[PDB]
């Protein structure tokens, strides 16, 4: 039983190293930096075609087409500019939790309580949309999934592990076990080489796709981590938890840099996203609102309030021109 | 103002909307019962059991085979017509019944209790719940089961429509 004692000693040593690496704080340096000011944006578009709660959305690469998944068993493609419907794919199972848009634009994916990930081909010769493949092997429900290429996809489940897939064969090529609780979040790096995941236990881990082992582990929260997002530069990320807190972790300092809390708001956090320049930090709360935080300074500057129910998803376009926000009242708005 | 292609795209969108409305109207006629806690003899996540009785489509969602934290996916079952709770040691069943009855998502969804000196335990079970005005508990000592489920669901749907109309 001395091995576990040595492991605890190693944990204490690495905590001491983390304390040693910290000499300054973000707030002290950013105090002199001028603030952003009050942020006011309005609902430019409102998309009304869903008859139930909306659980996921994802922007296309061109930042004009988007995809939405709801519990009526429907996955709808939206033309954002004119609020037109391009496709309406029906699903075999109506319990869905995730969306994904292929960077090429030819495929979409969805998963949920069915424990399988279904991939649909959008550009066929027959004029319809057909199920390209179904990926199975996870024991728990599917929480998130994101495309890498036309033939690679990473999924996360409640099995406390993540998986990489080969779509032309349908079999997993790598496994990223190591977590203790259910994995609820997922975020691919802009470089598409690194990978990050947060779990029900208050810990977030960094994975490498080509080797499949945990490079780094970050702690600091006290409840479930519900959302994670990657910084536009790939050297940091943001984690949003159930205890009304957001934290900014770094992949080189390997310690948290800043927290985003306020006594007025005490709820969960459902979605987290950044902006094009990294100065802004959107976040969706259970209290029917979406507070626009600030990255350099924790001061809250702006609120988006147009949803009757809580906001489940939150997306920001590639060119940073609009912010789409879906919610449980079966509508999704575009804010500019 | 609009091109011919734009007009055709708008017409396609209108057809999509019409099909969505028709599908919603179709799906609204079925009633969903969430099983929680062997009633499927007479008629890897969700195992939906489909049946029909007295010209009314019934979906039965058996979610007991999940082996994960219930607080993370139970909210997906908001809006279910009824929660069919099953009780056959009994202290654990009472504890989880109290947990599921006082959940924030289930403060307005009816619960049908199925059993598989009796007055004392029945009064205790119906007294475990706290809020008794707009929530009702239906008890049946286990042909007759499906008829009782039909009658209870009819009562719940009558009350729901009566409240929706504002009467």
């Amino acid at each position, epitope marked *: 039983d001395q091995l576990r004692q040595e492991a605890e000693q190693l944990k204490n040593q690495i905590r001491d190293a983390r304390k040693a690496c910290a000499d300054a704080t973000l707030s002290q340096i950013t105090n002199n930096i001028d603030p952003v000011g009050r942020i006011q944006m309005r609902t430019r578009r409102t998309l009304r075609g869903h008859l139930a709660k909306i659980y996921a959305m994802h922007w296309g690469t061109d930042s*004009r087409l988007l995809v939405s998944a709801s519990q009526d068993g429907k996955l709808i493609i939206w033309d954002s500019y004119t609020t037109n419907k391009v496709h309406a794919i029906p699903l075999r199972s109506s319990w869905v939790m995730t969306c994904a848009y292929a960077p090429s634009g030819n495929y979409v994916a969805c998963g949920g309580l069915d424990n399988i990930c279904s991939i649909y081909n959008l550009k066929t010769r*027959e*004029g*319809n949309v057909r199920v390209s493949r179904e990926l199975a092997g996870h024991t728990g429900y599917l929480s998130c999934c994101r495309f890498l290429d036309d033939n690679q996809i990473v999924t996360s489940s409640g099995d406390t592990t993540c998986a990489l897939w080969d779509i032309e064969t349908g079999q997993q090529t790598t496994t990223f076990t190591g977590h203790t609780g259910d994995v609820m979040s997922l975020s691919l790096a802009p470089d598409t080489r690194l990978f990050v995941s947060g779990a029900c236990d208050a810990s977030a881990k960094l994975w490498d796709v080509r080797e499949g082992m945990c490079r780094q582990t970050f702690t600091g929260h006290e409840s479930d981590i519900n959302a994670i997002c990657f910084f536009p530069n790939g050297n940091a990320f943001a984690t949003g938890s159930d205890d009304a807190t957001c934290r900014l972790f770094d992949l080189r300092a390997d310690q948290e840099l800043m927290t985003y809390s306020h006594d007025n708001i005490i709820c969960g956090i459902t979605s987290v996203s950044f902006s094009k320049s990294g100065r802004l930090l959107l976040a969706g709360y259970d209290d029917f609102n979406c507070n626009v935080w600030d990255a350099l300074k924790a001061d809250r500057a702006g609120v988006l309030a147009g949803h009757d129910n809580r906001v489940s998803c939150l997306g920001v376009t590639d060119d940073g021109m609009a912010v789409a926000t879906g919610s449980w009242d079966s509508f999704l708005k575009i804010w500019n | 103002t609009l*091109s*011919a292609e734009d007009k*055709a795209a708008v017409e*396609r969108s209108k057809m999509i909307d019409r099909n969505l409305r028709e599908d919603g109207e179709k799906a609204a006629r079925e009633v969903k019962l969430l099983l929680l806690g062997i009633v499927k003899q007479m008629k890897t996540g969700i195992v939906e059991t489909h049946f029909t009785f007295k010209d009314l489509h019934f979906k039965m969602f058996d979610v007991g085979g999940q082996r994960s934290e219930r607080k993370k996916w139970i909210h997906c079952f908001e809006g279910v017509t009824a929660i069919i709770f099953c009780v056959a040691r009994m202290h654990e069943s009472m504890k989880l019944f109290d947990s599921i009855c006082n959940n924030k998502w289930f403060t307005d969804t009816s619960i049908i209790l199925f059993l598989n000196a009796a007055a004392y335990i029945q009064c205790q079970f119906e007294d475990l719940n706290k809020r008794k005005d707009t929530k009702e508990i239906y008890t049946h000592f286990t042909t007759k089961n499906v008829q009782f489920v039909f009658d209870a669901v009819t009562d719940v749907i009558i009350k729901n429509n009566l409240k929706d109309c504002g009467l």
Partner: single-chain antibody
Amino acid sequence: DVQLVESGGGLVQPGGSRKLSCSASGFAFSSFGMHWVRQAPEKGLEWVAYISSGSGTIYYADTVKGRFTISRDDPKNTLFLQMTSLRSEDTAMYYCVRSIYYYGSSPFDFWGQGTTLTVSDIVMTQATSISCRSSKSLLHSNGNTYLYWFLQRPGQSPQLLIYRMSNLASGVPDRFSGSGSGTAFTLTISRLEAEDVGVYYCMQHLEYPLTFGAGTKL
């Protein structure tokens, strides 16, 4: 495989009605709008009639309006053209064309095999790399310009090359290119091997009376 086979036709005296039929197989017929396009033995293609998806919108040419009628049967996946009071001008070969309209689609994709019939507005110029010129600017306020290129090999039906002047159709080699400003459009071929010989047409899709060019031959 997608198949569009037209039937009917033949020899009919002037003033006698006729019915042309086209059967479609291998694709979702109810999601596509349909066109009839006729060509004279000595002239080029000429648009005839168009029926949208769901039969909720119909257009006819200004020279056959009133006499002709176009209809579709969706359960049987068939398209009908009823023609009355035929004259010597209607001696032409008729093709059936399919087209679907959403964001990013490619209309005028697949053309059928014509049937011979014998009885006994924006202007496009192809008087003369292939050149084409239009009377008015095809460019729209949303940034889309509508000019389509078709190639008809000898003894075969036309096939789509480039739609909206810039997007290459599926199954077409990357050698073909299209460019040009408003009212002046050009097509470029890198190297001219076999099977590239035929007649090239430029067509406009901006107002539903659709005008074809005179055509260019190599």
